[PDB]
């Protein structure tokens, strides 16, 4: 059972995908690859659909003002928002995820952009 999707991400505004009525014991697989631009894929899975924008924005708020160590603050926030996630598990910066369905019900898949730095003259997430 394989399905394809294509989309566009603008300024860290993610896209939700619905997985209606999965059964306990199923295994979900995900992979997200960049096909244009400077996008850095990120994927997460959760039960109740809530917009991560408000929570992820505080991570950019903290790093922009201090040291804060982004890789620490992002992991802590992600481990709360999502039941499972992956940043760079694939070829390059592409993500890949394996997730065993805990119980019976429906879940949501979140695709979007992570917080990264892409400069060597100065640090700016």
């Amino acid at each position: 059972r394989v399905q394809h999707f294509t989309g566009y991400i603008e300024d860290g505004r993610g896209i939700f995908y619905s997985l209606p009525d999965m059964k306990q014991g199923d295994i979900i697989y995900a992979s997200m690859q960049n096909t244009g631009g400077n996008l850095d894929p990120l994927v997460g899975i959760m039960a109740e659909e809530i917009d991560p924008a408000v929570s992820l924005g505080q991570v950019l708020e903290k790093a922009l003002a201090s040291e804060n160590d982004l890789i620490s603050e992002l992991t802590a926030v992600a481990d709360r928002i999502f039941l499972g996630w992956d940043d760079d598990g694939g070829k390059g910066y592409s993500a890949s995820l394996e997730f065993t369905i805990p119980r019976d019900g429906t879940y949501h898949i979140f695709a979007g952009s992570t917080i990264t730095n892409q400069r060597l003259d100065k640090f700016q997430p």
């Binding site: 040291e67 160590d69 982004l70 890789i71 620490s72 760079d88 910066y93 990264t116 730095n117 892409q118 400069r119 060597l120 003259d121 100065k122 640090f123």
Partner: protein
């Protein structure tokens, strides 16, 4: 003189086609790298760096690291200069580690380990919050202290 370069080595056991130079891999392995039996050879380098008024950012590129290797770095000021910030990124700018201030707060240290097939690292030292600092770096050298 001696010579330098890369090479390809084909070894065979009771396989007379090897001397032709075209032997394709077959069977079950019989030989292995000898260096893997002992501790990895350490490399250490020390540099003195100065952060002028207009040059408060400094970056350095490292040689490639093989999978399983480890990286260490530390910075200590020459005098009363304040402790700068230290971080490690790859060649694209993706952060990999951040420096931790020690309890005797006179130095900053960093540690990393290699997962990819080839890793190219960049060390960032910045004081953009005649200061002079000592930068000490090592590969497979946990004894930099």
């Amino acid at each position: 003189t001696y010579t330098t370069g890369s090479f390809q080595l084909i070894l065979g056991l009771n396989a007379p086609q090897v001397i032709s130079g075209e032997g394709e891999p077959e069977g079950e392995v019989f030989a292995s790298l000898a260096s893997l039996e002992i501790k990895p050879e350490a490399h250490v380098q020390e540099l003195e760096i100065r952060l002028d008024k207009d040059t408060r950012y400094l970056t350095q590129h490292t040689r490639n690291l093989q999978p399983g290797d480890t990286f260490h770095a530390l910075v200590e000021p020459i005098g009363e200069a304040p402790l700068p910030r230290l971080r490690l990124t790859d060649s694209g700018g993706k952060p990999l580690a951040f420096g931790l201030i020690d309890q005797p707060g006179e130095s900053v240290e960093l540690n990393y380990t290699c997962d990819q097939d080839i890793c190219e690292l960049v060390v960032h030292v910045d004081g953009t919050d005649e200061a002079v600092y000592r930068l000490l770096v090592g590969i497979n050298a946990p004894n930099l202290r």
